[PDB]
Symmetry: D2
């Protein structure tokens, strides 16, 4: 539990995941959170020096070969989350979409994420209750409904654990409606607010000041939103900046290129310069630590 | 209606040689399918490494089985799965075979490395006795269906030389192995002797950054190789790409510089076959 | 694939799970299907000589320490189903409740059950779309909605696989409404019909003749329904009789008794007569077959 | 806020002796909790047998971990889990410890049986060398938290006698085992010597239908035993009950005769604490 500085004992708290996340928010300006699809990606991000990582719901579906249409369940997300937290103590924020069902299912989701050593979740106000043959769409639940979802989650969560509420109201209802929802969500007990990228950076101050709690700005590619730098967002009062799919979009282009090279040429020579070396892989895996551990404890 | 194993065997017979590419997850298997591979591969080192673990036999049947199931749910392309040393004794090997068959897997490869039996044993690859690997093969063949393909891998060459390697491989065929998996031999002109002696189809392992050099599929085939495996090629490139995006975001405070190197939304939609979902709903519902 | 009779070769089909189930229906009068909560229970039932077994949705929840309120998902049910089918080829009927979501989730559920070597599922017409704070209740979806659920399932299922549709209309809508729904469900592509126990056995002929396809009667305890024998139900045209929780109710009383004995007495002597012997456990596990297998293949 | 391990240690210190009962699933753990046990147990043989498998080391970390997680999700009662021989080498043991800790497990027991290393090895229980078990313990203690409890089990008695058993057990304590798990000794008057030598708390295993006879908890305590385990007692009774219901239904065409032996809906509702769900919804919702 207790670390010390230099030679003499200072006070160190052994920190829950949620506490680590909140500290990462408070200590960064702003905290950049990067999407990672698997444990190996989280380790790459840790190595580069990110202080928080993210498990995207669309990433979970897409990596299973599925469209992001709400087909996946708590177990799909939970299993990918567990694999990442087994490999790193870097605070992990997990997408739980609409909570996967009613009050007790949201409760289960929260408790299971906490047991999986997750730091934070984000839950959104999209409609869940969809008729069997309903088309892919974005409708919002009523404000009261999302408050109930938040109430369900906060009822079971520990103090430290972070609930980040997301409203999808902006694209369809405009900035004023978005702020009203977000504020109701804070009143219901949301710890932080997750915001789609606003078209005008000078609207963030108004957003952030109204909601009070820390605001996350979602910087995805190939959407509608333009791309501001972390600095600019911070200067406008944003505390977290998320890069949800950036890494995996790039991985997919690379995999396809290798596959095409092998198929065209009957060999992967042309791909060699674009592969991580075995040596870099050994280093990210911290392979030496395994040798050193065996030598420390056993035969050496 | 084709069994997985039958699809794999047909891919072997009908390609010259059959190229088998590694895929770490279902999305990768779909990319490979899209490019037009006829068979795909789930690497044991890939399973471990993707979990943040070294390839030291820490992972078990469940780790590999879960990755296998996710791939086969997304594609009928025949999948060859690394089951390492079989994960335990005869009944564990039996469970591994039955579970891979239930997961719609087509083939496995099992190797003749020693199972790390001393608690604090150092990372190393020695061979089990020939008779031990025969037992492993016997365990697997006892429960497998006819169509399902067992590929036996001997690591004997590096430490025993070409003559001993052929002798092992042949004993493994006699025990019931369908096909033989060879570490890439120092010299392509070893393969003819190898391949002709063992009789059954031989797989050559074309990994990068190893000891083996890289021959073309044509050259391997001309030397009597029936399958060529590319176990980690795609995954190595994914990792470099991911790290570069992470460095870009960290250095520049934004991912602009990475944009040219990302798959577009439209290509992602196409690989996911997103339209087919819309089309399916339109076909069945709302009259 | 091919078995023979006596000495000479007769024609044998290697049968898919669904085909085994349909044959078990056709060959029994009626087919008794017993609930089993885990693989060891399925083996006990197989040993006694049942020809089909059942994985109850309430059983799955209750065994996890949860109420039967729709908290569990496809993975909870799927994992328990896989464990049972790994242990026995006896055709297994699995409760998938409302299908766990919309069209593609029902599709996933069907495909995953087929991959798990399941023979049949039953899906019911209870409302799924429930607001976050909705109370435990039984409302039916509209007939059209359940038809869509059936359409989703039949669209992906293999020929052999059996879809059994359940209407919960009876308790709240009466016999006439129940028959109307059931018939619409057959028209949508349901293979068989799953029926709560009717209060009067002489209503089954009307039920069974209207729906045409094989009818399963659900014989649970401690409900409203009275208990008819399998013979009587068959004589009234019922093809399957289900005993969903009977075994587990009895297991639970027994476990509690052992726990109380140990707690009261500081020892389990009084419980000994009510325990299965180690020898019977070895026999159900077919432990000898393991010894015989090792001796056949190896050192002997 | 109590760690699982701390709750377990307190249960040991505060009971005389602590009775630990086997539970195969979460519903059983809730039954045991309701009766008022202070600690519960997940048996490795129970894990296998419930999957339809013999207790021959076929199951892996995932089989046991999944059963453990389901129990701990339903109760905070400290759970002791059988991890057999640790499921592999040092890093597998490390993974087992870390994963049990993440699953909110309180304690494990690990035994000094040989890990079945030859493929076609016959069912048998021999001991590993003392040094091998020390390595196993070293691997586990290296990653475990302070509070988490490691119980070392020596099977030495049957084959080595009382003197050798004490010597092993003591070496295991020196290696870092928190507590010691003893197969029931032929004679209750062996325990005092055993317990006094090893120093740390000793668990006595009260299984049925074995070689061991059944002493009362009082008698064991008076001989210096700190914990008494009832590993399969409930499960054996469940199986007899299930089979009887199955035979009744099959013989009689109906389950009438079984009704008196079933838990009532009302008792099931109470163990599930069904009312608490209604009360929770009423507390939070609809104003
Ligand atoms: Cl490695
Ligand atoms: Cl056994």
């Amino acid at each position: 539990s207790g670390v010390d500085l230099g030679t003499e004992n200072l006070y160190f708290q052994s920190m829950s995941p949620g506490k680590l996340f909140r500290q990462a928010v408070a200590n960064e300006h702003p905290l950049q959170i990067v999407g990672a699809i698997n444990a190996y990606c989280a380790l790459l991000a840790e190595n580069v020096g990110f202080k928080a990582i993210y498990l995207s719901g669309g990433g979970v579906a897409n990596t299973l070969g599925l469209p992001d249409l709400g087909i996946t369940d708590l177990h799909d997300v939970l299993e990918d989350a567990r694999r990442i937290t087994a490999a790193t103590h870097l605070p992990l924020l997990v997408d739980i979409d609409t909570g996967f069902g009613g009050a007790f299912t949201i409760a289960r989701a929260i408790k299971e994420m906490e047991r999986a050593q997750v730091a934070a979740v984000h839950m959104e106000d999209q409609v869940a209750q969809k008729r069997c043959g309903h088309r892919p769409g974005k409708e919002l639940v009523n404000t009261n409904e999302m408050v109930d979802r938040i109430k369900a989650a906060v009822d079971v969560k520990s103090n430290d654990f972070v609930l980040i509420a997301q409203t999808d109201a902006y694209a369809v209802e405009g900035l004023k409606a978005t702020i009203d929802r977000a504020c109701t969500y804070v009143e219901a007990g949301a710890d932080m607010i997750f915001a789609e990228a606003l078209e005008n950076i000078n609207d963030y101050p108004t957003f952030c000041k109204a909601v009070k709690v820390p605001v996350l700005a979602n910087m995805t590619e190939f959407g509608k939103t333009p791309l501001y730098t972390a600095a600019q967002l911070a200067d406008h009062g944003v505390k977290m900046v998320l890069y949800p799919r950036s890494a995996d979009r790039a991985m997919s282009k690379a995999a396809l290129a290798v596959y095409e090279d092998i198929k065209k040429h009957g060999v992967q020579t042309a791909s060699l310069p674009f592969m991580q070396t075995r040596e870099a892989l050994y280093e990210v895996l911290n392979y030496h630590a395994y040798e050193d551990k065996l030598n420390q404890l056993f035969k050496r």
